[PDB]
Amino acid sequence: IEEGKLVIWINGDKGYNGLAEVGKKFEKDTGIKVTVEHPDKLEEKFPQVAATGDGPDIIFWAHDRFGGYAQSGLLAEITPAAAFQDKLYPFTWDAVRYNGKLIAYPIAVEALSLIYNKDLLPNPPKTWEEIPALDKELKAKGKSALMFNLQEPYFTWPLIAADGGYAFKYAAGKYDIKDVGVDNAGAKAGLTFLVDLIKNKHMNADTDYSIAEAAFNKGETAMTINGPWAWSNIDTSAVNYGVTVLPTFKGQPSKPFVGVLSAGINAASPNKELAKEFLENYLLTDEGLEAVNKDKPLGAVALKSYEEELAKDPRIAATMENAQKGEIMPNIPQMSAFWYAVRTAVINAASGRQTVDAALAAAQTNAARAAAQLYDVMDAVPARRWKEFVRTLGLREAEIEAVEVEIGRFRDQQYEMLKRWRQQQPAGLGAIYAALERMGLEGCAEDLRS
Amino acid sequence: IEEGKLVIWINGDKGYNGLAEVGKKFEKDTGIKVTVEHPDKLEEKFPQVAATGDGPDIIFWAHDRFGGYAQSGLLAEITPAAAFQDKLYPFTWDAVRYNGKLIAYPIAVEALSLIYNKDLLPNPPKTWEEIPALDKELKAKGKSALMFNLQEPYFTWPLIAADGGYAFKYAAGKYDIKDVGVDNAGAKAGLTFLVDLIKNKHMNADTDYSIAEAAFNKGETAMTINGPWAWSNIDTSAVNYGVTVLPTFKGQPSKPFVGVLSAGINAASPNKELAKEFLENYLLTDEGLEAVNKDKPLGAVALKSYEEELAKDPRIAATMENAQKGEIMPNIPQMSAFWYAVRTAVINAASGRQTVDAALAAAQTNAARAAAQLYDVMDAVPARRWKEFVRTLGLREAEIEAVEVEIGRFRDQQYEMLKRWRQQQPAGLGAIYAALERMGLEGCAEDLRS
Amino acid sequence: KIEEGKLVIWINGDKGYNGLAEVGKKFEKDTGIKVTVEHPDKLEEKFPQVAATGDGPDIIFWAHDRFGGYAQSGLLAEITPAAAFQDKLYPFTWDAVRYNGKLIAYPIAVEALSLIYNKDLLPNPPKTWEEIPALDKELKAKGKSALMFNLQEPYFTWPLIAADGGYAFKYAAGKYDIKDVGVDNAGAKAGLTFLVDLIKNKHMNADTDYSIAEAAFNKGETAMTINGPWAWSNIDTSAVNYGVTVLPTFKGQPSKPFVGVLSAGINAASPNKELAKEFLENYLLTDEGLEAVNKDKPLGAVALKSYEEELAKDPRIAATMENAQKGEIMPNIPQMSAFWYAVRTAVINAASGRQTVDAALAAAQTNAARAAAQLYDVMDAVPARRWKEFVRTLGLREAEIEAVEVEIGRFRDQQYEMLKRWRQQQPAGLGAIYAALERMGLEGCAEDLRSRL
Amino acid sequence: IEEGKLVIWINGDKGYNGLAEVGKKFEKDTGIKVTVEHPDKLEEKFPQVAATGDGPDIIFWAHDRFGGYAQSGLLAEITPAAAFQDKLYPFTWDAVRYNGKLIAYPIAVEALSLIYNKDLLPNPPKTWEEIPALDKELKAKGKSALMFNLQEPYFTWPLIAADGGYAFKYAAGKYDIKDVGVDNAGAKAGLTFLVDLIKNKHMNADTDYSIAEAAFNKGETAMTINGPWAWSNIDTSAVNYGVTVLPTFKGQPSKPFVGVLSAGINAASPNKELAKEFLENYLLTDEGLEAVNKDKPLGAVALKSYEEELAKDPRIAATMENAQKGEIMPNIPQMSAFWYAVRTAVINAASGRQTVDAALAAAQTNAARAAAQLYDVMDAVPARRWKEFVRTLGLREAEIEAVEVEIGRFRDQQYEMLKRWRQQQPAGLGAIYAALERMGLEGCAEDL
């Protein structure tokens, strides 16, 4: 990397024009040129260019991917003054911590909230338990009380976690990966309540993001569950809506997963604290944070001073309230195995394939097993290119030869090769992604995101 | 296709500008404007657009692929006067014959020849038997007598056929498919002679086209076996070279396979007698072939009058001499199973995996079975995209479901789907290729052309 | 190496082999040539193995469907009965022992499904399938059901699927047209849709099998079942007072059960074909010879007319024959195994809801002539680790094995291509796979595969 | 099990009639009837019948299988007085030890030795390094110096271990599984010496047990490597032979694996006090051990008093000398993964498919991986009976469904089921054997 200069990588949906503008208020005080760039698959190019010792000085992305980055040492430890740490809400620091050391600056905070049609329903329920009675009263007008995406567990989790569910237990600054909380009594209570809504025809097991977003925006439903990304389409529609706290369940808050957009500094940067005075004293200010929000809104932000003027908008105040009541999304890569197991479980419980107890007991076991993720990779790559693929991944021929001399069948060898490769190299630095391009299988890469 | 104008498709390695000039005098006498276009992957685009009723009026391509076209009735039958057929060499007409009917006009003919470095070897051997002694005499000089591609059976076939090998017996104008000649005494004699060269380290089994063309063009070897397509890179190269007849084996001539560049006309063209007036009266003349040859050389051509002037080049005289000693390449679809079988046999014989008699006995049985080609397709497509692939091929949902309800395991379903599909749609109309690009997996497409 | 100047008969152990032996020793008491009757185990599968060598018995007794495979591999001699003798037996029975226009066996007995009803729970059995839902309602108030029969095997559901116009393969000229299957036509959809409707209206269960249904009827828990004459013995032992009658009509047309004919063929390698034709025509296919076998174990209904109207004084036997004349002869071609496989998938899937009726029958239509499913079953019946030993024991040559392995890479693909190539040289089905698995000490795999035919 | 009675299970290979005589001198002094029985594959029936709480009171078997038994607690812990333990050779006690606890009584000792034709070679070499030079001198008379089984690593191991090979490190009473020693400099030295013998045509890579036994018994070779089980077939032949210490390599002794025939007591026996009184006071004595030796010879025994009388046979003294210079075979179940890796490694080095260093580096990794054995199990069971097989093994339906909900392909599911099953049930209790027979798959049982 070139020294005496700052280069920022920001996602293209974000307010990159306003961000660069803070860089000119920074550059006329020191003379440091800021070029902000919005490459694509930035999250996925950054760890590959950074493993060489190259890339940008500051990386902007959601906090969950920063834990994988920090595991292979691609992010520098940050050392904000204790006075500066009190300028941001404390839970945002938990999201940007990895094995006891801070690795980035929290910027904006995002969580699900309850969105309701003010015309069909002036005062939304404060408890999940009220919703079945209110759905019956609304079905007399061809309306329903609540529709939201029941296919992805991100949307059903706030209820499954309210009474005591959790993904991976967090103590001592580390996530215990063999301590998952989807089989406890609280998760069973939440999923059973969600399953009960479906058996009492208050919701349909087939509702997905599209069906629910259409229903709410066409006035057919009184409430939905969605994040600030969906506020734009509700603006276009004629619906007059409000955003508010998620309903309690058994008296406790729904816990949506919280995602924190964060600014990390490259461990291979020579300008490490010339970058951090830009973040602490020029961007994480009331003035500099407004330049980015006026380009494209950040939603709710971690810096208290600017949050208290943005929270003059009840929508943003609600998002923050829901975030402070929620659960920080773990920044470890094992979160993918968790989503896979929990998604099968909610699908299976909602349809009757499994009881609630069987669905969650299976998800409990399968949340720590990585096999399913590997078998999917093999079936995303054409078998004629299997050996080339893991050579390109970086598994050395000694390990390859060790597999081939005792494993006979071809598929068995590939699984054993991929399994042993994942045991040497943790996810996720975009390695599987980077390999498919050097083989000319971007179509296969493409599809393996989905 | 538009009526009252001609569209020709010719490959880009061919002299399309000179052909266009022949097409421009054609319009000075006719008023019919002729457009020459050189799309890529044309062998594969033509049968797809022609099944539509579309495409060009005339298609220029190697005669072997016209048998598949003619199998689906995609090319118009031609009936040139006997006076005109006597203008071209008689064996070229056999190459454009299919089910007793002529389906194209022959243009140029090409076959392998012996290419020798006249500096390291003034008088090339007339017999294969001379070569071991001459390799000894040159390996004391750090060079070798002969290197040629031993990976593709196209190059080894002239020796296997000399003493009595043949692909499918040709009697009365039709190929007997339950009569294959790769297990006879002559084929075994020819192949063990080639294996013995390897066991005496006069050649090594991993020489391919790249290795051998480099070796000859940098002067490391005295002889190679290659076609007229390789002459120009030898021109740019510093080696002073000659071309002549292939060596005999056991006193009989080597029999290379002959390929004929041919011009068929679209069975769905409304401009068919305008197409046959252009080929018969303007292109297949000394003047029209000279226009294309001055653009890029055709090599040896089928029209006797112009071949007797091109043959003042010993290079071209040799190519025709070798073609007349060889055999026309069969244009039937079973030729794919044949090449697949024979390539396995030569590779396995040259490397020692099999004895000569076992390699040829297998190639004999496997010569008519196309199963192997289907299994390769399965491992060229990622299993995640299988169902989209056979839908895109045109296999209907009733047949896909009929397979899945009866056949349990995944690979078995994959094969049964393709098998049933190939029974309704013959090869090779470029269906499998067109489907893969249209899913955005050309990476899989190219690797399957390979 | 068969014996001359002697007769050896093979008959199944359920049949009356002692009675057959006396007509065979009464045959000798006029001829001087003795007949040994033998009831081997799995005779049906040992015969084509020893008969392909040129050995085995001179006469083979078995169901007619099993003889078409034999006659295609030339293991049975064409028979030449006089037209006068040919007129002594019911005409449709001769259709059953015909293959490529030539007669290949002698018909002896006839057997088909019938409607079996509890005379105490039900004085008048319904004569239409359409009556059954109303009468089932009426018995479910008394803890009973109207009708239970095996819904796992399509042999038992076919009579209803065939009533309104279903058929397996159309039989014209002297051959079955294999590209003319009749399980997707309007009549099949009507019959199968009626049967699924019985299930979704809780008048029957999709999981009823032969054991469940025989138990229910024989303990009086259900008023009707559908079964053939083999099951009459267990209903006799039970206390149930039962009758046998014609199957119900559907849409006004008769139920069409499949007809099976027990037949006597002669070994193509026997030197005693004239001695065989002498015994069957003049000693067994007579009223004595047929009463001697019926005296040991009942044959049911018989093909020779003179004796049938003597047996048909038993209403049970009269009903099986009436039902047989209303049905169609089971095709004796080898594609019938693929047919059963396809239709059984279809009835199972329609009755359980995995498929709609339109789709279940459309798939069986396509799959009715394809044999691949049976080959993939064999691959998963043999442990992969013993595959090469298995195909050697079948008789597949090493050149064929090696030719597959050099061209095809993946294991399953090689396994199928070997069996596929093996089946192209050796036709189905002479029980070769069964005999090979036993010679390796894999009887467990052997039976587990016979469990499925 | 019946109380006030002894039931002993011994293999039909051993002198069971002589054992029963020791068992009736026990019945005339106590009044306790002893039945000795030789069931078939008792090795596999015992852990199945012992887990219900049944089976025999005393089990006689090779010490290797007792570590699996002790891992599931099927054998009683013994605590013989130090006075008794001093009557047997001390290394034999290490073989009947598991997690620091004694689990059986050592009876007999067995190890490979160097067998030489005293006619073709009066004084055998004491050194492996002498053998190439000595082979050339014998190949002038159509003979060879040495042929032995090179397909099973049991026979090649003594030389690979001489200069520093080992399977798993033995700390104080447990084998460290994150420490395998077939990649070290000494293992490479021994295996390279053996490959060199092959590349210099002193041995052929295809020699197996029969070829080597034939060659030695037909007089065509001067030396072989084999155990005392082979002395009888060499007696039958006309060859006049001797038995001696294995050759040293780089000055250090060859270290063969030693196996100890041992007597364990059923954890469910109500007669454990009577079992130890029979073994301590009646069998493991000079009187009682020769009563079984008269029936069929034990070889070398663990009891010093009686071994010093049998070691009057130079054949037997050599067997013991080789065992005291060798190492006890580990009784842990991970030894199957070890042999699998090492057998591939020696084969591939001997054939040229791998270099010595690569073959040994591969076996180093693969010695701790059990995947290969699971895949082999799947291909021994017909796929139509995979799910029934995993039920019969004892994997519970919740774990089966957890696989079926997430894993798509059938082969993948059975592998995941079996791997998870092996992680909740250790080897080797003969479970896979018991399951295959209860399904009617005896062909599948034997072949496995």
CSV table of C-alpha atoms in Angstrom, one decimal, chain A residues 177-447:
chain,number,residue,atom,x,y,z
A,177,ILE,CA,-19.5,-23.0,19.4
A,178,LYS,CA,-20.6,-26.1,21.2
A,179,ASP,CA,-23.2,-24.1,23.3
A,180,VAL,CA,-26.2,-23.3,21.1
A,181,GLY,CA,-29.5,-22.2,22.5
A,182,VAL,CA,-32.1,-23.4,20.0
A,183,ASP,CA,-33.2,-26.4,22.0
A,184,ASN,CA,-34.0,-24.7,25.3
A,185,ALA,CA,-37.5,-24.2,26.7
A,186,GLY,CA,-37.6,-20.6,25.6
A,187,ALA,CA,-37.0,-21.4,21.9
A,188,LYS,CA,-39.5,-24.2,22.0
A,189,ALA,CA,-42.1,-21.8,23.5
A,190,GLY,CA,-41.4,-19.2,20.8
A,191,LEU,CA,-41.5,-21.6,17.8
A,192,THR,CA,-44.6,-23.3,19.2
A,193,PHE,CA,-46.3,-19.9,19.4
A,194,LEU,CA,-45.3,-19.2,15.8
A,195,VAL,CA,-46.4,-22.7,14.7
A,196,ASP,CA,-49.7,-22.2,16.5
A,197,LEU,CA,-50.4,-19.0,14.5
A,198,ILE,CA,-50.1,-21.2,11.4
A,199,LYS,CA,-52.4,-24.0,12.7
A,200,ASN,CA,-55.0,-21.5,13.7
A,201,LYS,CA,-54.9,-20.0,10.1
A,202,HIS,CA,-53.7,-16.6,11.4
A,203,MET,CA,-50.7,-17.0,9.1
A,204,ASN,CA,-49.8,-19.2,6.2
A,205,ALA,CA,-46.7,-21.3,6.1
A,206,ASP,CA,-45.9,-20.3,2.6
A,207,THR,CA,-45.5,-16.6,3.2
A,208,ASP,CA,-42.1,-15.3,1.8
A,209,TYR,CA,-40.6,-11.8,1.6
A,210,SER,CA,-42.4,-10.9,-1.6
A,211,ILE,CA,-45.9,-12.1,-0.6
A,212,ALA,CA,-45.7,-10.3,2.8
A,213,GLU,CA,-44.3,-7.1,1.3
A,214,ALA,CA,-47.0,-7.0,-1.3
A,215,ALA,CA,-49.7,-7.7,1.2
A,216,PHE,CA,-48.7,-4.9,3.5
A,217,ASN,CA,-48.1,-2.4,0.8
A,218,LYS,CA,-51.4,-3.1,-0.8
A,219,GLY,CA,-53.3,-2.6,2.5
A,220,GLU,CA,-54.3,-6.3,2.9
A,221,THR,CA,-52.5,-6.7,6.3
A,222,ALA,CA,-52.3,-4.6,9.4
A,223,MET,CA,-48.7,-5.4,10.4
A,224,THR,CA,-45.4,-6.6,9.0
A,225,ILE,CA,-41.9,-7.3,10.4
A,226,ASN,CA,-39.1,-5.7,8.3
A,227,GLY,CA,-36.0,-3.5,8.5
A,228,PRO,CA,-35.3,0.1,7.3
A,229,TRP,CA,-34.5,-1.2,3.8
A,230,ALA,CA,-38.3,-1.7,3.2
A,231,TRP,CA,-39.4,1.8,4.3
A,232,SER,CA,-38.7,3.1,0.7
A,233,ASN,CA,-41.3,0.9,-1.0
A,234,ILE,CA,-43.9,1.7,1.7
A,235,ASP,CA,-43.4,5.3,0.9
A,236,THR,CA,-44.2,4.7,-2.8
A,237,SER,CA,-47.4,3.0,-1.8
A,238,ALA,CA,-50.5,4.9,-0.5
A,239,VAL,CA,-50.1,3.2,3.0
A,240,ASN,CA,-49.8,5.5,6.0
A,241,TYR,CA,-47.6,3.5,8.3
A,242,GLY,CA,-45.7,3.6,11.6
A,243,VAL,CA,-42.7,1.8,12.9
A,244,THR,CA,-42.6,0.6,16.5
A,245,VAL,CA,-41.2,-1.9,19.0
A,246,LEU,CA,-41.6,-5.6,18.4
A,247,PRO,CA,-44.3,-7.2,20.5
A,248,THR,CA,-43.2,-8.9,23.7
A,249,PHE,CA,-43.7,-12.6,24.2
A,250,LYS,CA,-44.3,-14.0,27.7
A,251,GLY,CA,-43.5,-10.5,28.9
A,252,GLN,CA,-40.1,-10.3,27.4
A,253,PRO,CA,-38.9,-8.4,24.4
A,254,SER,CA,-38.5,-9.9,21.0
A,255,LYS,CA,-34.7,-10.0,20.2
A,256,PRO,CA,-34.0,-9.3,16.6
A,257,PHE,CA,-30.5,-9.9,15.4
A,258,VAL,CA,-28.5,-6.6,15.3
A,259,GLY,CA,-26.1,-5.7,12.5
A,260,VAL,CA,-23.6,-2.9,13.0
A,261,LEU,CA,-21.9,-1.3,10.0
A,262,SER,CA,-18.3,-0.8,11.1
A,263,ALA,CA,-15.1,0.8,9.9
A,264,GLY,CA,-12.0,-1.4,10.3
A,265,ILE,CA,-8.4,-0.6,9.6
A,266,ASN,CA,-6.1,-2.8,7.5
A,267,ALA,CA,-3.5,-4.6,9.5
A,268,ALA,CA,-1.1,-4.1,6.5
A,269,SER,CA,-1.8,-0.3,6.4
A,270,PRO,CA,1.2,1.9,7.1
A,271,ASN,CA,-1.1,4.8,8.0
A,272,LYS,CA,-2.9,3.1,10.8
A,273,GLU,CA,-3.4,6.0,13.0
A,274,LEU,CA,-3.6,8.6,10.3
A,275,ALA,CA,-6.7,6.6,9.4
A,276,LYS,CA,-8.1,6.6,13.0
A,277,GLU,CA,-8.0,10.3,13.5
A,278,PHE,CA,-10.1,10.6,10.4
A,279,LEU,CA,-12.7,8.2,11.8
A,280,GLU,CA,-12.7,9.4,15.5
A,281,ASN,CA,-12.4,13.1,15.0
A,282,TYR,CA,-13.8,13.8,11.5
A,283,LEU,CA,-16.3,11.2,10.5
A,284,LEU,CA,-17.6,10.0,13.9
A,285,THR,CA,-18.8,13.5,14.7
A,286,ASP,CA,-22.2,15.1,14.4
A,287,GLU,CA,-21.1,17.2,11.4
A,288,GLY,CA,-19.3,14.4,9.4
A,289,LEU,CA,-22.0,11.8,10.1
A,290,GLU,CA,-24.6,14.1,8.7
A,291,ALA,CA,-22.7,14.4,5.4
A,292,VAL,CA,-23.1,10.7,4.8
A,293,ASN,CA,-26.7,10.5,6.0
A,294,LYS,CA,-27.9,13.3,3.7
A,295,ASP,CA,-26.5,11.4,0.7
A,296,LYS,CA,-28.2,8.1,1.7
A,297,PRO,CA,-29.5,7.7,5.2
A,298,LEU,CA,-27.6,5.5,7.7
A,299,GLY,CA,-30.6,4.7,9.7
A,300,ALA,CA,-29.7,4.6,13.4
A,301,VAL,CA,-26.1,5.4,14.3
A,302,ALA,CA,-23.8,4.4,17.1
A,303,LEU,CA,-22.7,7.9,18.1
A,304,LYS,CA,-25.1,9.2,20.8
A,305,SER,CA,-25.0,12.9,19.9
A,306,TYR,CA,-26.2,12.4,16.3
A,307,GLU,CA,-28.6,9.6,17.2
A,308,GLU,CA,-30.6,11.9,19.5
A,309,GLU,CA,-31.4,14.2,16.5
A,310,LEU,CA,-32.1,11.3,14.1
A,311,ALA,CA,-34.2,9.6,16.7
A,312,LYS,CA,-36.5,12.7,16.5
A,313,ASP,CA,-37.9,10.5,13.7
A,314,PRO,CA,-39.9,7.8,15.5
A,315,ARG,CA,-39.0,5.3,12.8
A,316,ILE,CA,-35.3,5.5,13.7
A,317,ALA,CA,-35.9,5.7,17.4
A,318,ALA,CA,-37.9,2.5,17.1
A,319,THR,CA,-35.1,0.8,15.2
A,320,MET,CA,-32.6,1.6,18.0
A,321,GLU,CA,-35.0,0.5,20.7
A,322,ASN,CA,-35.4,-2.8,18.9
A,323,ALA,CA,-31.6,-3.0,18.5
A,324,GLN,CA,-30.9,-2.4,22.2
A,325,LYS,CA,-33.4,-5.1,23.1
A,326,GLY,CA,-31.9,-7.5,20.5
A,327,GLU,CA,-29.0,-9.8,20.1
A,328,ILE,CA,-25.7,-8.9,18.4
A,329,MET,CA,-25.2,-11.1,15.4
A,330,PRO,CA,-22.1,-13.3,16.2
A,331,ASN,CA,-19.1,-12.4,14.0
A,332,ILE,CA,-17.9,-16.0,13.7
A,333,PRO,CA,-18.1,-18.0,10.5
A,334,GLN,CA,-20.1,-20.9,12.2
A,335,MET,CA,-23.2,-18.6,11.9
A,336,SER,CA,-23.7,-20.1,8.4
A,337,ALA,CA,-24.1,-23.6,9.8
A,338,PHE,CA,-26.6,-22.1,12.3
A,339,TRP,CA,-28.7,-20.5,9.7
A,340,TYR,CA,-28.9,-23.8,7.7
A,341,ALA,CA,-30.0,-25.8,10.7
A,342,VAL,CA,-32.5,-23.2,12.0
A,343,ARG,CA,-34.0,-22.6,8.5
A,344,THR,CA,-34.7,-26.3,8.1
A,345,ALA,CA,-36.3,-26.3,11.6
A,346,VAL,CA,-38.7,-23.4,11.1
A,347,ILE,CA,-39.6,-24.8,7.6
A,348,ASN,CA,-40.2,-28.3,9.1
A,349,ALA,CA,-42.2,-27.1,12.2
A,350,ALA,CA,-44.4,-24.7,10.2
A,351,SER,CA,-45.4,-27.4,7.7
A,352,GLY,CA,-45.9,-30.4,10.1
A,353,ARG,CA,-42.9,-32.4,8.8
A,354,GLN,CA,-41.6,-32.3,12.4
A,355,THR,CA,-42.9,-31.5,15.8
A,356,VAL,CA,-41.5,-28.4,17.4
A,357,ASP,CA,-39.4,-30.6,19.7
A,358,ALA,CA,-38.0,-32.6,16.8
A,359,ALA,CA,-37.3,-29.6,14.6
A,360,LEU,CA,-35.3,-27.8,17.3
A,361,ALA,CA,-33.5,-30.9,18.6
A,362,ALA,CA,-32.3,-31.5,15.0
A,363,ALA,CA,-31.2,-27.9,14.6
A,364,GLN,CA,-29.4,-28.1,17.9
A,365,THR,CA,-27.2,-31.0,16.6
A,366,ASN,CA,-26.8,-29.7,13.0
A,367,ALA,CA,-25.8,-26.2,14.1
A,368,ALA,CA,-22.3,-27.3,14.9
A,369,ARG,CA,-21.8,-29.7,12.0
A,370,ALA,CA,-20.2,-28.3,8.8
A,371,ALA,CA,-20.8,-31.3,6.5
A,372,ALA,CA,-23.9,-29.8,4.7
A,373,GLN,CA,-22.0,-26.7,3.7
A,374,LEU,CA,-19.3,-28.9,2.1
A,375,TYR,CA,-21.6,-31.3,0.2
A,376,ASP,CA,-23.3,-28.2,-1.2
A,377,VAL,CA,-19.9,-26.8,-2.5
A,378,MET,CA,-19.1,-30.1,-4.2
A,379,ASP,CA,-22.5,-30.0,-6.0
A,380,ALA,CA,-21.9,-26.4,-7.0
A,381,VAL,CA,-18.7,-27.3,-8.9
A,382,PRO,CA,-18.7,-29.7,-12.0
A,383,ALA,CA,-17.1,-33.0,-11.0
A,384,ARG,CA,-14.7,-32.9,-13.9
A,385,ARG,CA,-13.1,-29.8,-12.2
A,386,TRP,CA,-13.1,-31.1,-8.6
A,387,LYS,CA,-9.3,-31.8,-8.3
A,388,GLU,CA,-8.4,-28.5,-10.0
A,389,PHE,CA,-10.8,-26.7,-7.6
A,390,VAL,CA,-9.1,-27.8,-4.4
A,391,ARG,CA,-5.6,-27.3,-5.9
A,392,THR,CA,-6.7,-23.7,-6.7
A,393,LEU,CA,-8.0,-23.4,-3.1
A,394,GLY,CA,-4.5,-24.0,-1.8
A,395,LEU,CA,-4.6,-27.5,-0.5
A,396,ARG,CA,-1.2,-29.0,-1.1
A,397,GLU,CA,-0.4,-32.1,-3.1
A,398,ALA,CA,0.9,-34.0,0.0
A,399,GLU,CA,-2.5,-33.7,1.5
A,400,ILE,CA,-4.1,-34.6,-1.8
A,401,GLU,CA,-1.9,-37.6,-2.3
A,402,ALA,CA,-2.6,-38.7,1.3
A,403,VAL,CA,-6.3,-38.7,0.6
A,404,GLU,CA,-6.0,-40.6,-2.8
A,405,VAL,CA,-3.9,-43.5,-1.5
A,406,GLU,CA,-6.4,-44.7,1.0
A,407,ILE,CA,-9.8,-43.3,-0.2
A,408,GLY,CA,-11.1,-45.2,-3.2
A,409,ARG,CA,-14.3,-43.7,-4.6
A,410,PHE,CA,-14.1,-40.3,-6.3
A,411,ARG,CA,-16.8,-38.4,-4.4
A,412,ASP,CA,-15.4,-39.7,-1.1
A,413,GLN,CA,-12.0,-38.3,-2.0
A,414,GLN,CA,-13.4,-34.9,-2.8
A,415,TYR,CA,-15.3,-34.6,0.5
A,416,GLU,CA,-12.2,-35.8,2.5
A,417,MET,CA,-10.1,-33.3,0.6
A,418,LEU,CA,-12.5,-30.4,1.2
A,419,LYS,CA,-13.0,-31.4,4.8
A,420,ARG,CA,-9.2,-31.5,5.5
A,421,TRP,CA,-8.8,-28.2,3.6
A,422,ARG,CA,-11.3,-26.5,5.8
A,423,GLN,CA,-9.5,-27.8,8.9
A,424,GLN,CA,-6.4,-25.9,7.9
A,425,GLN,CA,-7.9,-22.7,6.7
A,426,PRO,CA,-10.9,-21.0,8.5
A,427,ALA,CA,-13.7,-19.3,6.7
A,428,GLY,CA,-14.4,-16.8,5.4
A,429,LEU,CA,-11.9,-14.9,3.4
A,430,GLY,CA,-13.7,-15.4,0.1
A,431,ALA,CA,-11.4,-18.3,-0.8
A,432,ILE,CA,-14.1,-20.6,-2.3
A,433,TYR,CA,-15.3,-17.5,-4.3
A,434,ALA,CA,-11.8,-16.4,-5.5
A,435,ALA,CA,-11.0,-19.9,-6.7
A,436,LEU,CA,-14.0,-20.2,-9.0
A,437,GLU,CA,-12.9,-17.2,-11.0
A,438,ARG,CA,-9.5,-18.4,-11.8
A,439,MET,CA,-11.1,-21.5,-13.3
A,440,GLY,CA,-13.6,-19.6,-15.3
A,441,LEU,CA,-16.6,-20.8,-13.3
A,442,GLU,CA,-18.1,-17.4,-12.3
A,443,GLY,CA,-21.5,-18.8,-13.1
A,444,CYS,CA,-20.8,-21.5,-10.4
A,445,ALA,CA,-19.5,-18.7,-8.1
A,446,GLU,CA,-22.6,-16.5,-8.8
A,447,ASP,CA,-24.9,-19.3,-7.9
